[PDB]
Symmetry: D2
């Protein structure tokens, strides 16, 4: 209760799964939220499922769309006032090794997972700095930003990039007294409707050689660390990686 | 409010500084707390300053005292019921390089910072496992568990040890379905009365080449990440390192 | 002497600085080498300065040029036989924070430092696998793949990407018994003619708060770790990061 | 050939396995070597198997024996002249979780793996500094200094300690211009006669979920990285971790 009072958050890919849970908990803690997603059908439903338009709205946007980022920030401020909090959560995966990744696949994934995060972080710093907002940028950077996976080559590239680019941004903001923190969150495997739609995926993810807890997480596991990072409770945390993975990376 | 309802926590070195702030926020969130420290004068005052004996008590103990750990767990359970949460926060520092560390200094520091954490973690697992408590062991492992400092040789050894020993414990608990999580917290420099008593220390800690934010933290910065880790909000986090350092390790 | 007997290496950006030193030591250890660079004037001079055409040749290529990679591998094999070793060393830097990076700057840097490394790694795996060559791909991934720098935002992104993408590739090659290893090398600051051309740069790099050794490295420092990684001496090393930085990242 | 000309090395636990291979390659590269071990029977045989007494000798010593360290350095200097190189390789393992580790087991393992490395590093700095030797201390710090293992609790503690204590020492030596480098080497699983004596161990170590290469290493894999680190080739490497693990930590 009240942990995000006054905050105004953008959550990319906020209409499903992890992003939707982050949105839900943000609203519960007093934030106003603009969620984005590619599909209006899904997105309007999602916003209404969380709260009323005075609490949460949807904005249709592909995070790779540089011009759309400007429109997104403007729409959010029009609805809720100046943005304090950005969660760069939108992302896609290609299930290919580096060897077998086509250049089109490479470019498509990087456009969302790397360029999109860059566009959001860059614009967020510019729009959120020097306003006394306790501003916070939270970049979703995966266990695949720490360890490789033989069949996630491009995804690994994107997540390693987000991990270290976020430190750069954190440092510049800190050094310049911008009142903007930047941190990364690194989920392990999380149960969502999309995982449920892939037969055997959860079971394979839950083997002890993968996730030592013997089961996978759930979207609220990621929501709660994001509440901490968005809140003023984490005012001394910047440039750091927050891993919530069931032990995946500990072995 | 209510984030630690029902929890029963031991916080070593809980009478001062970081430990005291962790205790204060734990009580505010509904936990019952036993704080430890070496000095009864300080410790009884500290407990009363936070709350009444039904909320928080003091137990005099040096964390290097193996036999005392058993007495501490027994006293805490007698007061509050079964322990769910342990914060291994007690620690000391020697301001010597490896080269200049005497063997007595080495042994003294390791007894508190390494043996003490081992004793607490080992006993905590045994006493807290398999009780449906949502048990959590939080080990204080420092930015000096990630980077070296030329004048903190023994301290660095102890903090690196705690960092990786905690992963071992996390994994065993996960694999055995013990319902015990183990994580480490890594503060950067934090302002306390002890720092205030060392002329020039805060200023040197606050130079941008040390802490990019240009100032040091405060005890509640560490309290809030500990609330998260003690709570069931972090039920999928185990074997991980949580850094709150003002950017120190990001550069 | 003889540590790279029989090896055939491509070194991108091999006409200057670090790349040139890697080429020089590779030839001294018995490898045949194709160096690349953008400028024929510089590149032909460089090759001849190291050895004769039976030892080392130049191929003009921008590592962002996907089609040129195919031509480079074909030219190298025509000259020297099947390629065993690839050093993805070509890279550029933009001296901008994330906030101040233009999209053109972002795309330009990623094209060389990320796409180029992807193109080389992908093609290298395909061309070098399953030939009994003891093949090795060495990706230059910087101290800026571990820590952020407030004025190297895009560079940090690229180096973090290379760091983790290389692990993916390493794992797939290992799991598939391809006889290809992939590792990253992370130089700290190294003295080159280009550094000498920036007044004050070496001095600033040599301050103890930057490089604890109080001076910067020299190109052969990076050459020697690359000899190790190219050689069969390192046949059990894959997916790892090799840092040669004067202590930069240790504090 | 000649890569360690003039060097004088102490290798603890040099009579078997990894240590013996390091000794063998050191002698081949021109170093004079004193190997240590607990058992004279084994140690004298081992030294003679590598070379003549003008190249390599044995000194009986338990690395936990603080007073014996002084005698070891004196004996080595008497035989070969001033010591330039120390490899802290002696170590033991206890196959217990943190939960199940007895205090006696804890103390025994730490005495060898942590105190012994401290004693050697401390004395090495004192004896090797400021002599123009290109001195190098190489501390064996394991993949178990990066990741936990549920049944290696005390071992993990010791290896994490060595990892970060070595950075402290590296930094102090660098900052004080001591001409001493300190680095850590982190083997994955390596085939030795002792591994061969444990039925099924190699096979379990070689499963892809453990070592992605599908086989384990051999002692010379660790010898060759130690040659690099002992040599002047690595004069800009200090405070760093060198992992040779078949991909174990990359996933
Ligand atoms: N859940 C897991 O099993 C798991 C495990 C490891 C890492 N992760 C990472 O964690 C992040 C969040 O996961 P999730 O569960 O929310 O994802 P999800 O349930 O798998 O659904 C995919 C998400 O990606 C977003 N997205 C993809 N392309 C987009 C685009 N062009 N523009 C805007 N949004 C786009 C979608 O946003 P919209 O629905 O709003 O259109 C959607 O929410 C992901 O980026 C993923 O890489 C997830
Ligand atoms: N605050 C900082 O500037 C800073 C920076 C980096 C890391 N840290 C680490 O964070 C941890 C918490 O810091 P802090 O601010 O609470 O410490 P502090 O204000 O500096 O005071 C020292 C603390 O160490 C505890 N302690 C030392 N020996 C003990 C023993 N034998 N038995 C029980 N307790 C013992 C004391 O416990 P009692 O008072 O209860 O007797 C006391 O709370 C420390 O372990 C420290 O290593 C602190
Ligand atoms: N030296 C340092 O101070 C330092 C410090 C940290 C990291 N690094 C990294 O280490 C790597 C090697 O450094 P260095 O000293 O060799 O570089 P350098 O002396 O600074 O010269 C720049 C190099 O980048 C290469 N390059 C840039 N764009 C290229 C392109 N489009 N196609 C082919 N080559 C291109 C050039 O190759 P050609 O000359 O052949 O055209 C040239 O060798 C660099 O990638 C750099 O990011 C260097
Ligand atoms: N080989 C592996 O499967 C493996 C895997 C991961 C990590 N490691 C680590 O790598 C290091 C080297 O392995 P290794 O193969 O040489 O060991 P090993 O073949 O398993 O034999 C044990 C070694 O430990 C040394 N040792 C134990 N206690 C000692 C003491 N009190 N004083 C002096 N030496 C002592 C012995 O030295 P002496 O024989 O001279 O008496 C012996 O060489 C070890 O410390 C180990 O922790 C090994
Ligand atoms: C971990 C991850 O990003 C992923 C993506 C698609 C399918 C399975 C896993
Ligand atoms: C960082 C730390 O532990 C310390 C301890 C004593 C004095 C100054 C710093
Ligand atoms: C470290 C690095 O890449 C760099 C590049 C250009 C100028 C100064 C440093
Ligand atoms: C990895 C390691 O140290 C070990 C020790 C004893 C038995 C098996 C493994
Ligand atoms: Mg792993
Ligand atoms: Mg640093």
């Amino acid at each position: 209760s009240n942990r995000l009072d006054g905050k105004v958050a953008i959550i990319t890919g906020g209409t499903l799964g992890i992003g939707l849970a982050i949105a839900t908990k943000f609203v519960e803690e007093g934030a106003k939220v603009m969620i984005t997603g590619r599909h209006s059908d899904v997105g309007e439903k999602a916003a209404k499922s969380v709260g009323t338009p005075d609490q949460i709205q949807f904005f249709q946007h592909d995070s790779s769309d540089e011009d759309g980022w400007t429109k997104l920030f403007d729409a959010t401020e029009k609805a809720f006032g100046p943005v304090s909090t950005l969660v760069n959560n939108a992302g896609i995966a290609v299930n290919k090794s580096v060897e077998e990744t086509t250049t089109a696949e490479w470019r498509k994934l990087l456009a969302v997972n790397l360029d999109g995060v860059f566009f959001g972080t860059r614009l967020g710093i510019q729009r959120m700095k020097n306003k006394g907002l306790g501003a916070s940028i939270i970049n979703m950077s995966s266990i695949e930003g720490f360890v490789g996976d033989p069949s996630l080559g491009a995804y690994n590239a994107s997540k390693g990039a987000v991990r270290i680019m976020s430190k750069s941004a954190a440092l510049d903001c800190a050094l310049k007294d911008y009142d903007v923190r930047v941190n990364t969150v690194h989920p392990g495997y999380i149960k969502t409707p999309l995982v449920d739609d892939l037969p055997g995926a959860e079971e394979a993810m839950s083997q002890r050689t993968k996730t030592p807890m013997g089961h996978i997480g759930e979207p609220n596991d990621i929501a709660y660390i994001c509440v901490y990072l968005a809140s003023n409770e984490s005012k001394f945390a910047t440039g750091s990686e927050f891993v919530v993975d069931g032990g995946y990376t500990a072995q």
